[PDB]
Amino acid sequence: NPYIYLGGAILAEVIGTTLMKFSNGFTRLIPSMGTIICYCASFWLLAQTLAYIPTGIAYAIWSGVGIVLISLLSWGFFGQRLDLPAIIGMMLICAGVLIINL
Amino acid sequence: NPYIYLGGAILAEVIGTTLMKFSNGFTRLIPSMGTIICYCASFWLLAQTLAYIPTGIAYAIWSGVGIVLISLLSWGFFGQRLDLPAIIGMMLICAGVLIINLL
Amino acid sequence: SSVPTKLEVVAATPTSLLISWDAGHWWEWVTYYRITYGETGGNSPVQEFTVPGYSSTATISGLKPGVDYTITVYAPTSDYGSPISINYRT
Amino acid sequence: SVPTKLEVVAATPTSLLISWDAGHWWEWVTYYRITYGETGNSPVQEFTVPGYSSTATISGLKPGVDYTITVYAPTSDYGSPISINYRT
Ligand SMILES: C[N+](C)(C)Cc1ccccc1
Structure with a gap:
């Protein structure tokens, strides 16, 4: 429950x-x-x-999923230009979410 | 005061x-x-x-200090709840943030 | 040790009432008090309007003279403090 | 460029009803400020109207006198402010 509203505030x-x-x-x-x-x-x-x-x-979870979702929809709006450091770093904080979330 | 100004927002x-x-x-x-x-x-x-x-x-400065400043401020102002074990997740969440911004 | 405290009718009028309360200490001040008024008889619901929580006074208008009324001042919440209710015959 | 379609609808010797095209939803702006004064010897007057509103009223004018009315964007980078002239 609490991480549903946190992610909702992230969105x-x-x-x-x-x-x-x-x-x-x-x-x-x-x-x-x-x-x-x-x-x-x-x-x-x-x-x-x-x-x-x-x-x-x-x-932390907000500072994480914040830039993660900001850059997530960045490639899906402007065709943003990054690569490997962005995508594996996303899964890095995402993995960090798992160990601070349920 | 160039970065101390930035440090004013984070604080x-x-x-x-x-x-x-x-x-x-x-x-x-x-x-x-x-x-x-x-x-x-x-x-x-x-x-x-x-x-x-x-x-x-x-x-990147925001994440680091904020994950540190307010967590140490919550460890003193109020206390701690903690509904999952690893504390190192916030540093690895920040690490994932550090290597998507700086990298 | 509850807020608000001391709910009194400052000025009366057949069709209006001026009331106030003790908001307490600065840490006991709230963001919006909601205030409710209605008839004492109870053959009707209750009229409600909010007021910002930095003001301790409130003016009510549109009352009928002679009738006894009941006034109650709430908090932003309700299950965390205690409210006050009074009566007044205009 | 965004403030457009400026004309006087109803004209009384002492008041003027003005309107404009507030753009179109995604180009809708927060507010339009309206400036009216004598065509000036006398001072100029100013007020503001919310940007969803495409109309506004101007009261308290002297009869016969020619006036100049200007409607500004809430900012600037929406184009030059449109202005016209009318005689009550
Ligand atoms: C008001 N902020 C800009 C600090 C929103 C925010 C950003 C990142 C994490 C938590 C909250």
Whole structure:
């Protein structure tokens, strides 16, 4: 249960930072409101998922799946350019998730 | 103060996360206001530091210090719950982060 | 040692009431108090409106004169503190 | 370029009803600021309208006087601000 909401907050911050890159400096109304909604929800998600799991544990898993999912949908949006260090490092933190998650 | 500025964001967030535990789901005023105040200061200067400092340095520093600062702050402010054994996972999670950003 | 404390009716009016409460200490302050009011008889539900948790006063409007009413001030939560309820005949 | 389609719909000697094309969803912007003043000897006036709203009202104008109205983007990189002229 707790790592379902943590991963949900991971998906929320990632969508918020991508809609921020779409909109300009608090300009494009539809993604700007999308950023405010994604943030106020992710903050309300982190404020509820941190009382369950240790704070430092959710910090790591989020910092991990954060860049992992940010770069995951990066190749599926711009055809981003990286290679072996990115993909094996993804499975590295992903393996680190397994030993801090269930 | 070039990287100390960056160190200001990582530490302001380290503080706001531990204050978010006191926010009680944004239902306790002073920690609920405190955690929003600590993050907007992190927001402010992050935009300042990012003018000169690149990117993969910021996240890699964030992960390391945050996995260390707030975990040692949670080991003192509150305590420990732990629902799985390996502590080294956070360092290997960070290692997986270090070799996808820097590498 | 519960918040809020001391719920009183500052100003009265046949169709309005001005009330306040002791928010407690700074660490006892909350983000939003929700306040509920209705008839004492109970032939009706309950009207509810929130108010930010940094203010200790609240004004209610649209009441009917002469009727006895019951006012109750809640917290953002409810199962973590204790509320107060009073009465007032306008 | 994004603020477009600017014309006066209804015109009273003392008020002007203006509208524009707020773009289109993904190019919808947060707000449009509207600047109206005498065509200037007198000062100019300014207010803002949310960006989902494509219309706005301007009240308190003197009859007969020619005015100049300008609608700005919430930022800048959406094109030059559109401006016109009208006589009540
Ligand atoms: C408000 N932040 C930018 C620190 C969001 C975040 C990023 C990474 C991990 C946890 C939380």
